[PDB]
């Protein structure tokens, strides 16, 4: 575990502590939850707020700001929803399979999110992903590395410079691999790196399902009205 | 073509 990679882990931890509020104080600013697509204005506000936080995290990733402005946008458009699902694992609890954010009120279950349309085709695999991510019992250092590796992916559609993206991801991947050996003891570290990259593959199919869900729902202007301008810009055309 | 996202970068 080198000079350079302890620097990286310190940066990502601080970046996360600045972009994820464990007290969830800003939830008062959202449009109120009502439990029709009753919850969508509240969840749209939650997602929109979370995209801002994901962007703030991404900008602090060592090597990210050295990318083009255009490559940064490509990486955030494709990765935003995936990092949101990753970072939501902190609020997700396995007592009742819900995201618990202080009150409830601000706690969300499958009935809160899968009532309308074909959204269960996304929610059922997403809950299973949350359970699977939770059973990894990640160190916080591993949690923030995985989000950063998720953001800086060289295979996102539309990436121009990919070698540099790969270079930035490799230095994060090799930080995660070396961290698991030196800091994660057995048996919890057994194939832990392979199980984490597997969760990156789960995010890809959850992202693909998400794009199909969003496209169908945004196609109805009545529901697109309830979203936010940021959400529409990022989850785009 | 992403005014808000570009502004959230810098
Ligand atoms: C983003 C965070 C959190 C995320 C929590 C959840 C639990 C509730 C359901 C959340 C918000 C998911 C969204 C509803 C995806 C939503 C948002 C959107 C626009 O991407 C979409 O099409 N979705 C799925 C289709 C859908 C439409 C209408 C109602 C329900 C689903 C994605 C992440 C999930 C909760 C906290 O941990 C903070 C963290 O930053």
A143 is in an annotated binding site: no
List the Cα angle A203/A208/A213 in 5-degree steps: 120
Rounded Cα distance, A87 and A92, in Å: 9
* Residue-wise DSSP of A148-179: HHHHS-TTSTT-S--HHHHHHHHHHHHHHHHH
Half-sphere exposure of A87 (CA within 13 A, CB side): 31
In three-state secondary structure terms, A229 is helix
Q: After which residues does a break in chain A occur, C–N more than 2.5 Å?
A: 35
Q: Which of A15, A99, A100 has the alpha carbon at shortest distance from A58?
A: A15
* Pairing state between β A92-93 and A98-100: antiparallel
Which among A69, A77, A230 has the least Cβ separation from residue B4? A230
In this structure, the number of other CB atoms found within 10 A of the CB of residue A48 comes to: 17
In three-state secondary structure terms, A38 is coil
Q: Which residues pair with A98 in a beta bridge?
A: A93
Cα torsion at A51, A53, A55, A60 (round to 10°)? -160
Distances from the Cα of A154 to the Cα of A7, A223, B6, angstroms:
23, 33, 20
Are the C-beta atoms of residues B3 and B9 closer than 8 Å to each other? Answer: no
Peptide bond between residue A159 and the one before it cis (omega within 30 degrees of 0)? no
Rounded Cα distance, A13 and A83, in Å: 15
Cα torsion at A68, A12, A196, A20 (round to 10°)? -100
Rounded Cα distance, A40 and A75, in Å: 26
Rounded Cα distance, A124 and B4, in Å: 32
Q: Total structural domains in chain A?
A: 1
A·B CB contacts under 8 A: 26
CATH number for A195 = 1.10.565.10
* Residue-wise DSSP of A129-148: HHHHHHTT---HHHHHHHHH
Which among B3, B4, B9 has the least Cβ separation from residue A69? B9
In this structure, the number of other CB atoms found within 10 A of the CB of residue A82 comes to: 22
Q: Which domain holds residue A186?
A: 1-237
Q: Which of A37, A115, A54, A83 has the alpha carbon at shortest distance from A207?
A: A83
Residues of A in contact with B5 (CB under 8 A): 55, 73, 76-77, 230, 233-234
Residues of A in contact with B6 (CB under 8 A): 69, 73
Distances from the Cα of A224 to the Cα of A19, A40, B5, angstroms:
27, 10, 19
Rounded Cα distance, A146 and A52, in Å: 18
Mutate to test the interface with B, among A50, A234, A235 (most CBs of B within 10 A): A234
Rounded Cα distance, A170 and A162, in Å: 12
Determined by: X-ray
Which residue from A minimizes the CA distance to B4?
Answer: A230
Inspect the interface and report whether the beta carbons of A73 and B3 lie closer than 8 Å.
no
Rounded Cα distance, A87 and A50, in Å: 9
What is the sign of the dihedral through the CA atoms of A95, A204, A212 and A86?
positive
Task: Enter the tokens of residue A86.
Answer: 């990753």
Rounded Cα distance, A179 and A145, in Å: 10
Are the C-beta atoms of residues A15 and A57 closer than 8 Å to each other? Answer: yes
């Amino acid at each position: 575990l080198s000079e350079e990679q302890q620097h990286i882990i310190a940066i990502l931890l601080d970046a996360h502590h600045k972009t994820y509020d464990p007290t969830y104080a800003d939830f008062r600013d959202f449009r109120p939850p009502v439990r029709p697509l009753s919850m969508l204005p509240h969840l749209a506000d939650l997602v929109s707020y979370s995209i801002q936080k994901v962007i703030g995290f991404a900008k602090m990733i060592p090597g990210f700001r050295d990318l083009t402005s255009d490559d940064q946008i490509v990486l955030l458009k494709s990765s935003a929803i995936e990092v949101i699902m990753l970072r939501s694992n902190q609020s997700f609890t396995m007592d009742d399979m819900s995201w618990d954010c202080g009150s409830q009120d601000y706690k969300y279950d499958v009935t809160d999110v899968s009532k309308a349309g074909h959204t269960l085709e996304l929610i059922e695999p997403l809950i299973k992903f949350q359970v699977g991510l939770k059973k990894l019992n990640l160190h916080e250092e591993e949690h923030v590395l995985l989000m950063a590796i998720c953001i800086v992916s060289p295979d996102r559609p539309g990436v121009q410079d990919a070698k540099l993206v790969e270079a930035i991801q490799d230095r994060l991947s090799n930080t995660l691999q070396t961290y698991i050996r030196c800091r994660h003891p057995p048996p919890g570290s057994h194939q832990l790196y392979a199980k984490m990259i597997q969760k990156l593959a789960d995010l890809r199919s959850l992202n693909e399902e998400h794009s199909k869900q969003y496209r169908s729902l945004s196609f109805q202007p009545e529901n697109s009205m309830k979203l936010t301008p940021l959400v529409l810009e990022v989850f785009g055309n | 073509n992403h005014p808000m996202l570009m502004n959230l970068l810098k």
